[PDB]
Amino acid sequence: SFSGYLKLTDNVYIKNADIVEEAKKVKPTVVVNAANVYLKHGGGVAGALNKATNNAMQVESDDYIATNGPLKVGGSCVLSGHNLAKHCLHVVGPNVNKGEDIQLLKSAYENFNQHEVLLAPLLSAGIFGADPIHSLRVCVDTVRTNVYLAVFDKNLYDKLVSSFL
Ligand SMILES: Cc1nc(C)n(CCC(=O)O)n1
Protein backbone atom coordinates (compact mmCIF):
# COMPACT_ATOMS: atom_id res chain seq x y z
CA SER A 1 0.00 0.00 0.00
CA PHE A 2 0.92 3.78 -0.15
CA SER A 3 3.70 4.54 2.33
CA GLY A 4 5.93 7.47 3.22
CA TYR A 5 3.44 10.15 2.10
CA LEU A 6 3.03 13.53 3.72
CA LYS A 7 -0.63 14.41 4.27
CA LEU A 8 -1.44 17.85 2.78
CA THR A 9 -5.24 17.83 3.19
CA ASP A 10 -7.99 15.32 4.14
CA ASN A 11 -7.55 13.66 0.69
CA VAL A 12 -4.28 14.86 -0.89
CA TYR A 13 -0.97 13.17 -0.04
CA ILE A 14 2.50 13.85 -1.47
CA LYS A 15 5.83 12.00 -1.71
CA ASN A 16 9.20 12.62 -3.38
CA ALA A 17 9.18 9.54 -5.59
CA ASP A 18 9.54 8.22 -9.10
CA ILE A 19 5.93 7.45 -10.09
CA VAL A 20 7.08 4.34 -12.09
CA GLU A 21 8.86 2.90 -9.04
CA GLU A 22 5.88 3.85 -6.88
CA ALA A 23 3.47 2.14 -9.32
CA LYS A 24 5.57 -1.07 -9.43
CA LYS A 25 5.68 -1.16 -5.62
CA VAL A 26 2.04 -0.30 -4.81
CA LYS A 27 0.31 -1.74 -7.98
CA PRO A 28 -2.46 0.88 -7.46
CA THR A 29 -5.93 0.50 -8.94
CA VAL A 30 -5.23 3.71 -10.92
CA VAL A 31 -2.01 5.34 -11.99
CA VAL A 32 -2.46 8.72 -13.70
CA ASN A 33 -0.45 9.46 -16.81
CA ALA A 34 0.45 13.04 -17.80
CA ALA A 35 -0.81 12.43 -21.31
CA ASN A 36 -1.11 14.60 -24.40
CA VAL A 37 -4.20 14.56 -26.70
CA TYR A 38 -2.55 12.08 -29.08
CA LEU A 39 -1.46 9.66 -26.31
CA LYS A 40 2.08 9.92 -27.71
CA HIS A 41 4.08 8.90 -24.64
CA GLY A 42 7.42 10.41 -25.55
CA GLY A 43 8.87 12.10 -22.50
CA GLY A 44 8.30 13.07 -18.89
CA VAL A 45 5.93 10.88 -16.91
CA ALA A 46 4.31 9.48 -20.09
CA GLY A 47 7.58 8.36 -21.59
CA ALA A 48 8.68 6.82 -18.31
CA LEU A 49 5.40 4.95 -17.68
CA ASN A 50 5.33 3.74 -21.29
CA LYS A 51 8.95 2.52 -21.15
CA ALA A 52 8.13 0.60 -17.94
CA THR A 53 5.31 -1.24 -19.81
CA ASN A 54 7.81 -2.25 -22.56
CA ASN A 55 5.84 0.00 -24.99
CA ALA A 56 2.58 -1.92 -24.38
CA MET A 57 0.99 1.35 -23.19
CA GLN A 58 1.88 3.05 -26.52
CA VAL A 59 0.58 0.13 -28.62
CA GLU A 60 -2.70 0.15 -26.69
CA SER A 61 -2.86 3.97 -26.93
CA ASP A 62 -2.34 3.95 -30.71
CA ASP A 63 -5.28 1.54 -31.09
CA TYR A 64 -7.38 3.80 -28.79
CA ILE A 65 -6.55 6.89 -30.95
CA ALA A 66 -7.20 4.99 -34.19
CA THR A 67 -10.70 4.14 -32.90
CA ASN A 68 -11.62 7.30 -30.99
CA GLY A 69 -9.48 10.17 -32.20
CA PRO A 70 -7.60 12.49 -29.90
CA LEU A 71 -8.60 13.41 -26.37
CA LYS A 72 -9.53 16.98 -25.47
CA VAL A 73 -7.09 19.14 -23.43
CA GLY A 74 -8.62 18.74 -19.93
CA GLY A 75 -9.97 15.30 -20.82
CA SER A 76 -9.02 11.75 -20.03
CA CYS A 77 -9.48 8.13 -20.87
CA VAL A 78 -9.10 4.93 -18.87
CA LEU A 79 -6.83 2.31 -20.37
CA SER A 80 -4.91 -0.68 -18.97
CA GLY A 81 -2.33 -0.12 -16.27
CA HIS A 82 -0.32 -3.06 -17.75
CA ASN A 83 2.36 -4.21 -15.23
CA LEU A 84 2.07 -0.94 -13.26
CA ALA A 85 -1.57 -0.60 -12.11
CA LYS A 86 -5.04 -2.11 -12.76
CA HIS A 87 -5.81 1.00 -14.87
CA CYS A 88 -4.01 3.98 -16.27
CA LEU A 89 -6.04 7.15 -16.30
CA HIS A 90 -4.50 9.20 -19.12
CA VAL A 91 -5.22 12.81 -18.23
CA VAL A 92 -4.39 15.75 -20.51
CA GLY A 93 -3.38 18.82 -18.59
CA PRO A 94 -2.75 21.98 -20.66
CA ASN A 95 0.78 22.25 -22.02
CA VAL A 96 1.77 25.88 -21.53
CA ASN A 97 4.81 25.26 -23.85
CA LYS A 98 2.27 24.54 -26.67
CA GLY A 99 0.25 27.71 -25.71
CA GLU A 100 -2.67 25.74 -24.18
CA ASP A 101 -5.16 27.41 -21.76
CA ILE A 102 -3.80 27.07 -18.15
CA GLN A 103 -7.47 27.52 -17.08
CA LEU A 104 -8.07 23.91 -18.34
CA LEU A 105 -5.95 22.53 -15.45
CA LYS A 106 -9.00 22.45 -13.15
CA SER A 107 -10.97 20.48 -15.80
CA ALA A 108 -8.02 18.06 -16.10
CA TYR A 109 -7.98 17.46 -12.29
CA GLU A 110 -11.79 16.91 -12.27
CA ASN A 111 -11.10 13.60 -14.06
CA PHE A 112 -9.52 12.31 -10.82
CA ASN A 113 -12.92 12.56 -9.07
CA GLN A 114 -14.18 9.57 -11.04
CA HIS A 115 -11.72 7.30 -9.12
CA GLU A 116 -11.76 6.65 -5.36
CA VAL A 117 -7.98 6.48 -5.08
CA LEU A 118 -5.18 7.38 -7.52
CA LEU A 119 -1.38 7.47 -7.74
CA ALA A 120 -0.66 10.63 -9.79
CA PRO A 121 1.82 13.21 -10.92
CA LEU A 122 1.17 16.98 -10.72
CA LEU A 123 -0.66 17.82 -13.93
CA SER A 124 0.85 20.31 -16.35
CA ALA A 125 4.09 20.36 -14.29
CA GLY A 126 7.57 19.53 -15.70
CA ILE A 127 7.84 19.54 -19.46
CA PHE A 128 4.17 20.73 -19.69
CA GLY A 129 5.44 24.17 -18.55
CA ALA A 130 2.99 25.17 -15.83
CA ASP A 131 3.96 26.31 -12.34
CA PRO A 132 3.91 23.15 -10.14
CA ILE A 133 2.96 25.22 -7.04
CA HIS A 134 -0.15 26.39 -8.91
CA SER A 135 -0.80 22.77 -10.08
CA LEU A 136 -0.74 21.51 -6.48
CA ARG A 137 -3.13 24.33 -5.44
CA VAL A 138 -5.57 23.40 -8.24
CA CYS A 139 -5.23 19.72 -7.26
CA VAL A 140 -6.11 20.23 -3.59
CA ASP A 141 -8.96 22.66 -4.56
CA THR A 142 -10.44 20.33 -7.21
CA VAL A 143 -9.81 16.69 -6.33
CA ARG A 144 -12.10 15.23 -3.66
CA THR A 145 -11.01 11.60 -3.99
CA ASN A 146 -7.80 10.18 -2.43
CA VAL A 147 -4.84 11.32 -4.51
CA TYR A 148 -1.26 10.23 -3.78
CA LEU A 149 1.05 12.60 -5.60
CA ALA A 150 4.51 11.42 -6.62
CA VAL A 151 6.89 14.34 -7.27
CA PHE A 152 10.09 13.14 -8.93
CA ASP A 153 12.25 16.20 -8.36
CA LYS A 154 13.54 16.40 -4.73
CA ASN A 155 14.14 20.15 -4.77
CA LEU A 156 10.68 20.70 -6.23
CA TYR A 157 9.11 18.37 -3.62
CA ASP A 158 10.75 20.41 -0.81
CA LYS A 159 9.60 23.69 -2.41
CA LEU A 160 6.01 22.34 -2.81
CA VAL A 161 5.83 21.20 0.84
CA SER A 162 7.45 24.36 2.29
CA SER A 163 5.20 26.74 0.30
CA PHE A 164 1.95 24.77 0.74
CA LEU A 165 -0.79 26.88 2.16
C1 LIG B 1 11.62 20.48 -12.38
C2 LIG B 1 10.73 19.30 -12.58
N1 LIG B 1 11.22 18.05 -12.85
C3 LIG B 1 10.11 17.36 -13.02
C4 LIG B 1 10.05 15.92 -13.39
N2 LIG B 1 9.03 18.12 -12.82
C5 LIG B 1 7.61 17.78 -12.78
C6 LIG B 1 7.14 17.54 -11.35
C7 LIG B 1 7.93 16.47 -10.66
O1 LIG B 1 9.09 16.59 -10.30
O2 LIG B 1 7.27 15.37 -10.52
N3 LIG B 1 9.41 19.41 -12.54
Curated annotation (Swiss-Prot):
Mutagenesis / variant outcome for changing residue 162 to L: In strain: Gamma/P.1
Subcellular location(s) of the protein: Host endoplasmic reticulum membrane
Organism: Severe acute respiratory syndrome coronavirus 2 (2019-nCoV)
Quaternary structure and interacting proteins, as annotated: May form homohexamers. Interacts with N protein.
Protein name as it appears in the record: Papain-like protease nsp3
Residue intervals of the Macro domain: 1-165
Its membrane topology: Multi-pass membrane protein
Highest classification ranks of the organism: Viruses, Riboviria, Orthornavirae, Pisuviricota, Pisoniviricetes
Record annotation: effect of changing residue 29 to A: In strain: Mu/B.1.621
Catalyzed reaction equations: Thiol-dependent hydrolysis of ester, thioester, amide, peptide and isopeptide bonds formed by the C-terminal Gly of ubiquitin (a 76-residue protein attached to proteins as an intracellular targeting signal)
Residues of the full protein shown: 1027 to 1191 of 7096
Role of this protein: Responsible for the cleavages located at the N-terminus of the replicase polyprotein. Participates together with nsp4 in the assembly of virally-induced cytoplasmic double-membrane vesicles necessary for viral replication. Antagonizes innate immune induction of type I interferon by blocking the phosphorylation, dimerization and subsequent nuclear translocation of host IRF3. Also prevents host NF-kappa-B signaling. In addition, PL-PRO possesses a deubiquitinating/deISGylating activity and processes both 'Lys-48'- and 'Lys-63'-linked polyubiquitin chains from cellular substrates.
Regulation: Inhibited in vitro by GRL-0617.
